[PDB]
């Protein structure tokens, strides 16, 4: 049977999906907090060419 | 529409439903006196509805599948064992008596709901008004204690006054020897060992409290077994009654409305039967109660509400 | 008059001890009269004379409590020479609770009243020192 194989065993996507979603939200926070990117008395350096960002 | 203020306003009023035979009747009597057949004949002839006597499995035969259940669900009470060992130290006597009172209460509620809704009369084989009979019979025979009697009378004066008494009572008197002979002619092994004192106590309770208490608010027809037969005779005595005594005359559409909203709410009916008076004869315990409740819910048509069990052929559940 | 009950803080502790005693005794009598009123109106007595008895009883008890509190407080301020110490007021509330017990004839009430009234009085002194506000005006 294929339905009885997926009526159960489909719950094995929740927790991994949650991990992915949490990583996404952490990236969103990092994006929000970009007001000192390459503007810190330490790590403030001149930018390389083709380097559009010091970090996302 | 499920009955309510709105349906009552738009119509579905009671007084217009009624006719000459919209009456509640309770043919009472001792054991093996001839109540069931007489009730059936009256129902047939007058066009009323017949409600067989209410036993242990009424709430089941009238709910769900409509079949009997296992006894651990329907009261854990037995009449056979009541007759075998009446003075049991387990409490089956009052357990059975209270379960039966509650079943008759549920039955009277259903009967009124039917009458008021459709205007059709109903015939009962006993009533909540003639159930203290067996209780006093027990107490006079030391089958139960006084505390159980007080519990019973409390539930009585909590539940009974909210309901309209019957219109006519039909008591078929039969001497105690005649019934003590019929019970043996019937051949039920458990019923045969009933004591004639129990039956005399039933008869005395009837004669002394019931009939003189019901002869103030409903017409009593007292018959002997020779008039009880030829049931056309009792029908003729009914068709020519003068209902001029009782609370059914000081009624109106709104009193009927409220009484109907009540009797169509079975949980509000039976509320006062579950009051937390902790008698050791009906107190069930958490472990036992929870085992029984979980099993009952594991029962095919009882896990969910009616219409939501796909296990019994219910389909559009995702759309209700 | 409120100037009277404010005369308690016209001079620091260890001074005008008798005046402090009188003021605190009057305050205790006030509170006892209030309680007796509430206890005669509610839970009344079998007889008016018995109600007056209850009144006098509660009132004299409260007055004795206040007397001991104020007296011991000013005495400790006079002896150990630490007027700004909440510990003197703690001692005073403790003596008041010991009284409250003596009247009620209960060592348990004595201990509880001590450890509660002492805390309350010490916090009252702390509030008078650090300038707290009990019923403050809305300022935001």
């Amino acid at each position: 049977t294929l339905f009885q194989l997926l009526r159960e065993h489909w719950v094995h996507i929740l927790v991994p999906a949650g991990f992915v979603f949490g990583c996404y939200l952490d990236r969103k926070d990092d994006e929000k907090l970009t007001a000192f990117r390459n503007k810190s008395m330490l790590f403030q350096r001149e930018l390389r060419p083709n380097e559009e960002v010091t970090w996302k | 529409l499920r009955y309510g203020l709105l349906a009552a306003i738009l119509g579905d009023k009671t007084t217009k439903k009624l006719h000459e035979y919209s009456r509640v009747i309770t043919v009472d009597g001792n054991i093996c006196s001839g109540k069931n057949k007489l009730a059936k004949e009256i129902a047939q002839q007058l066009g009323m509805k017949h409600y067989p006597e209410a036993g242990i499995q009424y709430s089941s035969t009238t709910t769900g599948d409509g079949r009997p259940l296992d006894i651990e669900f329907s009261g854990s009470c037995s009449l056979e064992k009541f007759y075998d060992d009446p003075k049991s130290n387990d409490g089956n006597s009052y357990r059975l008596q209270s379960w039966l009172y509650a079943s008759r209460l549920l039955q009277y509620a259903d009967a009124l709901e039917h009458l008021l809704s459709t205007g059709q009369g109903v015939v009962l084989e006993r009533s909540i008004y003639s159930d203290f009979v067996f209780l006093e019979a027990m107490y006079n025979q030391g089958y139960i204690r006084k505390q159980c009697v007080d519990h019973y009378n409390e539930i009585k004066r909590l539940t009974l006054p909210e309901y309209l008494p019957p219109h006519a009572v039909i008591y078929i008197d039969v001497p105690v020897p005649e019934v003590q002979s019929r019970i043996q002619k019937k051949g039920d092994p458990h019923e045969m060992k009933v004591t004639s004192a129990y039956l005399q106590d039933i008869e005395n309770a009837y004669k002394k409290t019931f009939l003189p208490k019901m002869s103030e608010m409903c017409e009593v027809l007292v018959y002997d077994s020779w008039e009880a037969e030829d049931p056309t005779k009792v029908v003729e005595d009914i068709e020519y009654l003068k209902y001029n005594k009782g609370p059914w005359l000081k009624q109106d559409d709104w009193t009927f409305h409220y009484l109907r909203m009540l009797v169509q709410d079975k949980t509000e009916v039976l509320n006062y039967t579950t009051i937390p008076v902790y008698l050791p004869e009906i107190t069930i315990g958490a472990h036992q109660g929870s085992r029984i409740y979980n099993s009952f819910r594991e029962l095919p048509g009882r896990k969910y509400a009616p219409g939501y069990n796909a296990e019994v052929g219910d389909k559009w559940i995702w759309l209700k | 008059v409120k100037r009277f009950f404010e005369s308690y803080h016209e001079v620091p502790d260890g001074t005008q001890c008798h005046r402090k005693t009188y003021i605190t005794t009057a305050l205790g009598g006030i509170c006892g009269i209030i309680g007796s009123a509430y206890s005669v109106s509610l839970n009344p007595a079998d007889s008016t004379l018995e109600a007056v008895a209850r009144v006098g009883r509660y009132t004299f008890t409260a007055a004795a409590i206040g007397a001991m509190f104020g007296l011991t407080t000013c005495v400790s301020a006079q002896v150990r020479e630490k007027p700004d110490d909440p510990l003197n007021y703690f001692i005073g509330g403790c003596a008041g609770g010991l009284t409250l017990g003596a009247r009620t004839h209960s060592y348990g009430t004595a201990a509880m009243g001590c450890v509660y009234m002492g805390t309350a009085a010490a916090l009252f002194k702390i509030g008078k020192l650090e300038g707290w506000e009990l019923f403050p005006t809305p300022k935001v």
């Binding site: - | 969910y304 509400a305 939501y308 559940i317 995702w318 759309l319 209700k320 | -």
Partner: protein, 120 residues
């Protein structure tokens, strides 16, 4: 307190001065938490009335979710307007009465003399 401010329209939910605010994303965590409240409300409704959960009254659950998210969006626009007006009033009052809200002119720790409390 802001009730008696100039321009206060009595019984006005969105005064049309709030249309200068950045409206809220529809995937805002608050809205998709109101959505969870709606779903759990459908679930508890099915539970109390003895109905299968997660499989009964799917229209009812959808309705709950939509209503919750709707009320959320609009109530949230209003709350944003309110907090923005609060900031507006505050900054305006500060500009008007500067002498009561002066600068800090803070020194550096070379001039400050903080005491040392050892741990011994």
């Amino acid at each position: 307190m802001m009730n008696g401010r100039p321009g206060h329209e009595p019984l006005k939910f969105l005064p049309d001065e709030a249309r200068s605010l950045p409206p809220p994303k529809l995937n805002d965590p608050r809205l998709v938490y109101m959505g969870l409240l709606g779903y759990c409300t459908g679930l508890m409704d099915n539970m109390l009335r003895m109905r299968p959960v997660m499989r009964a009254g799917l229209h009812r659950q959808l309705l709950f979710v939509t209503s919750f998210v709707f009320a959320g969006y609009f109530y949230l626009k209003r709350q944003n307007y309110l907090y923005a007006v609060k900031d507006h009033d505050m900054f305006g009052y500060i500009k008007l009465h500067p002498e009561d809200f002066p600068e800090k002119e803070k020194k550096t720790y070379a001039e400050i003399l903080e005491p040392f409390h050892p741990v011994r």
